[PDB]
């Protein structure tokens, strides 16, 4: 009676976090066009038309990025995705043979007075007792000499093997959703301003988030998801220069990038059954690759970001921008993909300004390579074949990364310059508001009354 007994309830909402594996799911159309083959999104359990989202009430929660397990899950699978898409297409060992050449003739007749290197060597034919003579082109960023016509070599035949790209597979990213299995939930909170960590007042749960386009780029995030109405800054340990600086913005700015010289190709056979593609001959003028940008808008957003950036550095201090430092090229330039080729743009024509506290187009030069040591790995490398036609791609600039300098205490008007050279943080830039959790249905509590026998 006035003693109380116990009862058992099943399926009551509580959660305590954990970590498990995940899976991916995205299609509406892309398997039907497919270009007969794409980088491996092949079955992937195609998604749902109308996703589910439930707003929550009277709930707070601690939120911490930089410790999410999900970013390493996106790190590990793309590595396993990349080589698996690259492996069963055709190998080539016997290319890196000795070679001698000099430059091309109207290389000196252009704005691009640089490096073309009309070149030639011996190569085995389909029959083992026959050789053949070829004639081809290679940039100086893909050739280096030994220390007579001083003989050359490819860049890192001295380190690892080289495998050419498979001729039909595209590299263009498709949006992907990542979705959690049963007995789990994903939490996102929908505040406008979000300065990295801490509690969040209004949360909600979704089985699987919006699409992420895995673009491979440095110093400028492109085709990224856009922020809310106001620009934000994110970090770990500002006033401790070891880590990097992430900034997201609201007004996207255009960029146009082209390659003028359409420079037709040829194809011979290594044999048996190794159809090797190589660079043919060029016809027409020579203009090197470059990109345009709207000037006044770039002034406007840079004036926008410096007003926001000042709050974490006092009031009356002076901010100066600078170019990259040096070392390898791959942290200096802005590298990205477009149409199946890889550009390297100098971007020194942006971070050249000081700032005092009180229809034109910037043309920046770009260069191209043909051998990539992607994902900071040593042990493999890929060769990309050239593509005919004139390529042209447009994108939205959305999100730059920054790095401090040395100096002294808070008096000497600290500066900034780009850099970074990592790829994990770019996914940390766009998974900032998600975390996994596991439900627990079982509960027990005392009730008032008793049980019939």
């Amino acid at each position: 009676a006035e003693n109380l007994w116990v009862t058992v309830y099943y399926g009551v909402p509580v959660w305590k976090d954990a970590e498990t594996t995940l899976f991916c799911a995205s299609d509406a159309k892309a398997y039907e066009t497919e270009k007969h083959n794409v980088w491996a999104t092949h079955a992937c359990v195609p998604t749902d038309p109308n996703p589910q989202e439930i707003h929550l009430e009277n709930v707070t929660e601690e939120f911490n990025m930089w410790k999410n397990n999900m970013v390493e899950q996106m790190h590990e699978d793309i590595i396993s995705l990349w080589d698996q898409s690259l492996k069963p297409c055709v190998k080539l060992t016997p290319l890196c043979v000795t070679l001698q050449c000099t430059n091309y003739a109207p290389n000196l007749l252009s704005n691009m007075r640089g490096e073309l290197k009309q070149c030639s060597f011996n190569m085995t034919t389909e029959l083992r007792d026959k050789k053949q003579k070829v004639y081809s082109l290679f940039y100086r960023l893909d050739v280096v000499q030994i220390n007579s016509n001083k003989e050359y070599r490819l860049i890192n035949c001295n380190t690892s093997a080289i495998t050419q790209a498979c001729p039909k597979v595209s590299f263009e990213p498709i949006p992907i959703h990542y979705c959690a299995p049963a007995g789990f939930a994903i939490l996102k909170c929908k505040d406008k301003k979000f300065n990295g960590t801490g509690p969040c007042p209004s949360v909600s749960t979704v089985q699987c988030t919006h699409g992420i386009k895995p673009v491979v780029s440095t110093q400028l995030l492109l085709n990224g998801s856009l922020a809310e109405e106001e620009v934000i800054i994110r970090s770990e340990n500002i006033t401790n220069n070891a880590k990097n600086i992430l900034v997201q913005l609201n007004t996207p700015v255009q960029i146009n990038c082209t390659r003028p010289n359409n420079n037709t190709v040829k194809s011979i056979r290594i044999g048996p059954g190794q159809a090797f593609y190589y660079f043919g001959d060029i016809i027409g003028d020579i203009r090197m690759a470059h990109c345009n940008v709207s000037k006044a808008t770039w002034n406007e957003t840079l004036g926008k970001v410096v007003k926001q950036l000042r709050k974490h550095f006092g009031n009356n201090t002076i901010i100066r921008f600078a170019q990259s430092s040096g070392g390898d090229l791959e942290v200096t330039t802005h590298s990205f993909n477009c149409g199946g080729e890889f550009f390297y743009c100098n971007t020194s024509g942006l971070f050249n300004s000081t700032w005092i506290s009180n229809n034109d187009s910037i043309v920046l030069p770009c260069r191209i390579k043909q051998i990539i040591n992607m994902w900071q790995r040593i042990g493999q490398a890929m060769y990309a074949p050239p593509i005919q036609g004139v390529i042209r791609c447009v994108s939205n600039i959305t999100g730059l990364i920054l790095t401090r300098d040395g100096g002294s205490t808070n008096s000497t008007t600290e500066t900034f310059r780009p850099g970074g050279g990592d790829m994990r943080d770019n996914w940390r830039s766009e998974l900032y508001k998600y975390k996994v959790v596991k439900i627990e249905p079982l509960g027990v509590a005392p009730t008032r009354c008793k049980r019939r026998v």
């Binding site: 003693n3 309830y9 399926g11 709930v59 698996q84 749960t205 509590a445």
Partner: protein, 124 residues
């Protein structure tokens, strides 16, 4: 109106207690192995506590009572405010270092005695 999945988890007991069906209606709703590891994991967590519910004399009954009384060394809060001013997230952390004593004492209290008396009352 249907509040939805994990709906009133910030609310109090009596609001949350009346809607319990939707937690079960959502509970079982190269890249082939990692998908297949998920479905064998999802079937494992569901089937585990299911018989652990079924051993307690409650087969498919979502809410059910039992026989064992409450040892008052567990909590001291009497009846009313625990149904009226706390959440389950507040509740479950509060009684955490008890459950191993709870579950073992629960199961033998019914399903040893209440079957043996069943084997003696249906006897005669």
């Amino acid at each position: 109106v249907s509040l939805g999945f994990l709906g009133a988890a910030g609310s109090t007991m009596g609001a949350a207690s009346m809607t319990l069906t939707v937690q079960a209606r959502n509970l079982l709703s190269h890249w082939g192995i990692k998908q297949l590891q998920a479905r064998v994991l999802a079937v494992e967590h569901y089937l585990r506590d299911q018989q652990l519910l079924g051993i307690w004399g409650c087969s498919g009954k979502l809410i059910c009572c039992t026989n064992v009384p409450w040892n008052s060394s567990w909590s001291n809060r009497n009846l009313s405010e625990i149904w009226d001013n706390m959440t389950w997230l507040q509740w479950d952390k509060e009684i955490s270092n008890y459950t191993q004593i709870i579950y073992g004492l629960l199961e033998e209290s019914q399903n040893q005695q209440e079957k043996n008396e069943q084997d003696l009352l249906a006897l005669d």
